[PDB]
Structure formats: C-alpha cells, structure tokens
Design a protein around this ligand. Structure first.
Ligand SMILES: Cc1cncc2cccc(S(=O)(=O)N3CCCNCC3)c12
Lengths: 13, 346
C-alpha cells in the first residue's frame, strides 16, 4: 500500500 | 578490457567533447545569471484560456502563440518561507538553456502576484501516462531516463541542484520528449546545502537524516524515477511519510521479478545510501551512469539532438489542445502593492 495520487512537495520534514 | 581500441578511443573522445560543451554552456549561463531578465511582458498581453494545473493556458494576443502562465501569490510565498526558493526558481529558469528544460519566455509582476510565462507543453505530465498505462517497458523508461541524465549533467555542471525530480514534474512534448518543469527547489550550490525540501518518496537518505548534502541527491532521485517508470510504483512506498522515510534510510530495496539484471544493478548503484559508493558521486562522475550496461544501447548525442524516435507521441488535436491535462474550477490584482521589497529582484 502507498500513495498513488499526485504527491506534494514538502518545505520542511 | 571491456572495450577494444576503436570503442575506447571513441568513448574517451566523446567524453572530452562533453567537457568542451559544458564549459561553453557555463560561460553562457553565467552571463545570464549575472544579468537576469526582468519585466519582459505584462498581463494585458495575453488572453486567459483555461486553468491547467495556478498555471493557466494563455494566448498571446499579438502572436497567437499559446503559453503556460504560472501565477504566484506574493503574500502566500512569504507566509510559506519560500521567498528565496521562488527567487532561485525564476533566476535559474531565465539563465538556463537545454532541450529538455522548459523555456521561460516572459516574466513580470504586479501588486499581488509573480508571473512566469513558459512555453506550453501539450502532452501532459508523465505521471498521468504512467498511471494510465501502469508501467513503461525498459526501453521506454530508458528513453526518458537518458534525457534526465543529460539534463542533470548540464545542471550540475552549472553547480545547480534540481531537488524535485518526479513524474509529476516532467511534461511530454509534441515529439514525445521530456520537458523538466518545477524549478521551485532548484538552487545554485557550490558544495553542500542544508534545506529539508523535496517530495517524500524521492528524498535521498542524507536529506531525511538532516545532513549537509550535495548534487548526489539528484542521482538518488533518478534511481527512484527509473524504478517507478519501470515498475509503476516507487521503491519506497507507504501511506505516510514517516513510513516512507524509514524505508529510504534502511539501505534495502526490492525489485519486481520482471526487472532485468542490468536495470537492478544500475538502480542498486543509484539508490546507494553510502555516498562514497553512489553513482554520480564518484571520481568518474556522470560517466559511471552513462557507461553502465543498461544504457549500452543509448546514443547520447542522438538523444540530445532529438533524433531518436520517441516511444509514445501524445494525442494532439491542435494548438490550444488541453486534452492531456485535468479540468479545474479569477485573477484579483489588488490596489496596493504587496511584499514589494521581498521580490525586488524578480
Ligand atoms: C500545464 C503546463 C504545460 N506547459 C507548460 C507548463 C510549464 C510549467 C508548469 C506547467 S504544469 O503542468 O501546470 N505544472 C505545475 C506544477 C505541477 N508539475 C508540472 C508542472 C505547464
């Protein structure tokens, strides 16, 4: 199981 | 050895020609880096057609040419501490030149927003095509990977780190070649940098572990991309970021049974937690990657010249076509200029 949709960047951690 | 005389001489000469190309490209980059473009259009020069990602498809009124206009709300950039990153993005985009990097055509600003107007790439995100088809065959994945290898070889020679490789950030053009977008985390870095940023599934271990890190994070991310293109899912796959991070730092990766041994060997050397062993970080540089067996059939010059037949040509009905992008649900320029001082250089 895992993320199949579009993935957002992270700015911190 | 592995190569005979003719092959070793041709390869050595090819590698020297790369050095020559890159030295000229750096001279050109630095001239634009030191004297950046600014205020080369205004909003009134385009018609807003449709929202594509905000990123808007627009039509230039004088030329009739279509563009992708990225709109940044000055106030939201400050609250998010992305001021330096946004300044990086525009300064880098206006200075680079490479066949697989999206081309910034105009930029400007007003009281409320920053505008970046880029060439319109109509084929959609690689992400959509990959999820639709499931996975790419190894030759198909390799065609795209070769473009990323050349693009990173170019960027890194300019001391630029890209820091957000993923299928979401790669568009397919009308000839089936790649256009790298999303320079929001790109940075000019002589040696190390320290910002924790990127996308969880693609983060190198040294980022997760809060180390000073270098351009080798991009080569790790290439490993993640090639794996995902060829598998249909990425190597470190979990519902929550904390679970993703634990897998990344473990030093373990499992491969689908349909991966070739050549591909697995390449990926073990890219997805290498030990920086003293990671391809792209060694004495031989990018050549460890370009000379790997999995790329033995790749004509690197032919890829650069866009003379290789693409595996897939996106459907394209006409100049305004948005069929390869999604549907989305107005522009509010305020009477008072906001965060003017923070974005003087833009
Ligand atoms: C539509 C578009 C089409 N031609 C050129 C573009 C240039 C930049 C951005 C986009 S985008 O797909 O909205 N996009 C936003 C962020 C998501 N990652 C991919 C880049 C373009």
């Amino acid at each position: 199981a895992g993320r199949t949709g579009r993935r957002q960047a992270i700015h911190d951690i | 050895g592995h190569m005979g005389n003719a092959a070793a001489a041709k390869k050595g000469s090819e590698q020297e020609s790369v050095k020559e190309f890159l030295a000229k490209a750096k001279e050109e980059f630095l001239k634009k880096w030191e004297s950046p473009s600014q205020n080369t259009a205004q909003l009134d020069h385009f018609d807003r057609i449709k929202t594509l990602g905000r990123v808007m498809l627009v039509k230039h009124k004088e030329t009739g040419n279509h563009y992708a206009m990225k709109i940044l709300d000055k106030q939201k950039v400050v609250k998010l501490k992305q001021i330096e990153h946004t300044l990086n993005e525009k300064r880098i985009l206006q200075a680079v030149n490479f066949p697989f990097l999206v081309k910034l055509e105009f930029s400007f600003k007003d009281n409320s927003n920053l505008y970046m107007v880029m060439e319109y790439v109509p084929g959609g995100e690689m992400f959509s095509h990959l999820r639709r088809i499931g996975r790419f065959s190894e030759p198909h994945a390799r065609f795209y990977a070769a473009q990323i290898v050349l693009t990173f070889e170019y960027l890194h020679s300019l001391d630029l780190i890209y820091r957000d490789l993923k299928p979401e950030n790669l568009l397919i053009d009308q000839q089936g070649y790649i256009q790298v977008t999303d320079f929001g985390f790109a940075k000019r870095v002589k040696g190390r940098t320290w910002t924790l940023c990127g996308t969880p599934e693609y983060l190198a271990p040294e980022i997760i572990l809060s180390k000073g890190y270098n351009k080798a994070v991009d080569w790790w991310a290439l490993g993640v991309l090639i794996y995902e293109m060829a598998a249909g899912y990425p190597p470190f796959f979990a519902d929550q970021p904390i679970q993703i991070y634990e897998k990344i730092v473990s030093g373990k990766v499992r491969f689908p049974s349909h991966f070739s041994s050549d591909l697995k060997d390449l990926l073990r050397n890219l997805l290498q937690v030990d920086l003293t062993k990671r391809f792209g970080n060694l004495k031989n540089g990018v050549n460890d990657i370009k000379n790997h067996k999995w790329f033995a059939t790749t004509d690197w010059i032919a890829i650069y010249q866009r003379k290789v037949e693409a595996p897939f040509i996106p459907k394209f009905k006409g100049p305004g076509d948005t069929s390869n992008f999604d549907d989305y649900e107005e522009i509010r320029v305020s009477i008072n200029e906001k965060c003017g001082k923070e974005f003087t250089e833009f």
